[PDB]
Symmetry: D2
Subunit: 114 residues, 4 copies
């Protein structure tokens, strides 16, 4: 299945935060309605935050996360979870090699804000 | 039910990160095997990161998140999600008032690291 | 927090299924837009299905699960999870006593159907 | 990533339940520690329960779900969620064709029982 694609409510503020756990330099691309609106590039093996931004989901509400290392796409896994019928998490893990820890770039999307 | 309590595998490195979305100053306490090992304090209405740390789950693996605002315990909601049978998220929302957005402090715990 | 309350898309078919794991007879009430539309009653300590139905979420999309044993309300825990940005689960556990297994009645709501 | 594979605690009773939502007849295979221990078969476009069983996770705790339609493997999506640090759901969706609803067979694994 396609992974890393989420339908948010339209015209809604959301946060996106990426963590790195890999020897490879992670490039996280955030697309809103098929346009790149944020890019984080960084490296850590200690869960360092490579970026965090507030964005708007726009008319279509489509948010897509892509992760690559040195131009090669990582394999993605994702899910959305809702707590208290209001607090939303859209979660992405990614794997750049063969150890299958899926933590090489970890991306958390959260809404609502404020 | 009790919320914000998670059993991690023993002696395992994990990340903990907190975001704020409230007029109130949030105080997030992280306990590992019933000892306070991190405290994050801050205020934001725009998803600022008020803290992020790497910790070890120790012999018992017990991790508890507490959130308080101006001396009062916030109401917590929580769940753990596992992707690809390997990548773990322990998620906490909290509510300091009556609007029930449960985003006033948002806490994400993730493992494995590295 | 309030638990067992979910907002579904309006006017949408969904399934609801209840399992029992308790010495006590479980009463599961399913409310759609604040009206009880199904009641499942049964007893099992081995995960028997005490009820399953297909229902419609109506204009407001509000679905609420209540669980009681001999007229006394059980304590609830709940979350919603979405896979492949399409497949939805709304999950409820409940506790009728003090062992905190939260499996005494387990309720799974799923959509879309068809 | 591999999907539909879950590590349960060893030697633990669990429930597995499957629903169908497709014109195609679903065959759900349940493997425990790499041995087939249950097969559920049926055809419904209205969320019929095509099987429910109680099984034991054995020494290794490995549970795998496979889904096929007339001999052809469906594409799987999956995740595990834990509520109240105790109640576990292992969730599978599957897609037999081109609409990407991922509901064609839906499988819910739950533990603990009793
Ligand atoms: C410079 C690059 C190294 C790799 S890799 O294939 O070795 N993958 C990085 C691995 O780093 C380990 C320390 C560990 O975190 C493992 O999970 C990770 O996949 C590149 C692709 S680029
Ligand atoms: C200085 C403090 C104000 C409050 S409060 O009860 O008003 N709660 C804060 C509320 O802030 C809003 C901007 C919004 O984020 C809302 O969700 C939040 O509960 C204190 C408790 S302390
Ligand atoms: C006949 C009744 C017994 C109880 S109870 O309070 O003892 N709770 C039932 C308990 O049953 C156990 C077998 C186990 O499943 C436990 O988790 C459950 O809470 C009534 C309330 S009525
Ligand atoms: C090319 C293929 C067609 C089928 S099918 O005819 O069995 N249809 C499967 C579809 O049934 C619909 C009613 C709907 O539930 C849809 O989601 C489902 O995939 C194949 C098995 S392969
Ligand atoms: Ca890796
Ligand atoms: Ca890694
Ligand atoms: Ca609030
Ligand atoms: Ca708030
Ligand atoms: Ca109980
Ligand atoms: Ca029980
Ligand atoms: Ca389909
Ligand atoms: Ca279908």
């Amino acid at each position: 299945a396609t992974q890393g694609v989420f339908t948010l409510p339209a015209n809604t503020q959301f946060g996106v935060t990426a963590f790195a756990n890999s020897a490879g330099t992670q490039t996280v691309n955030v697309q809103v309605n098929n346009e790149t609106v944020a890019t984080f590039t960084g490296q850590s093996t200690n869960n360092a935050i490579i970026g965090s931004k507030v964005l708007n989901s726009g008319g279509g509400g489509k948010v897509q996360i892509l992760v690559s290392v040195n131009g090669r796409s990582s394999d993605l896994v994702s899910a959305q979870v809702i707590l208290a019928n209001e607090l939303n998490f859209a979660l992405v893990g990614s794997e750049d090699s063969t150890d299958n820890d899926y933590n090489d770039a970890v991306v958390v999307i959260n809404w609502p804000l404020g």
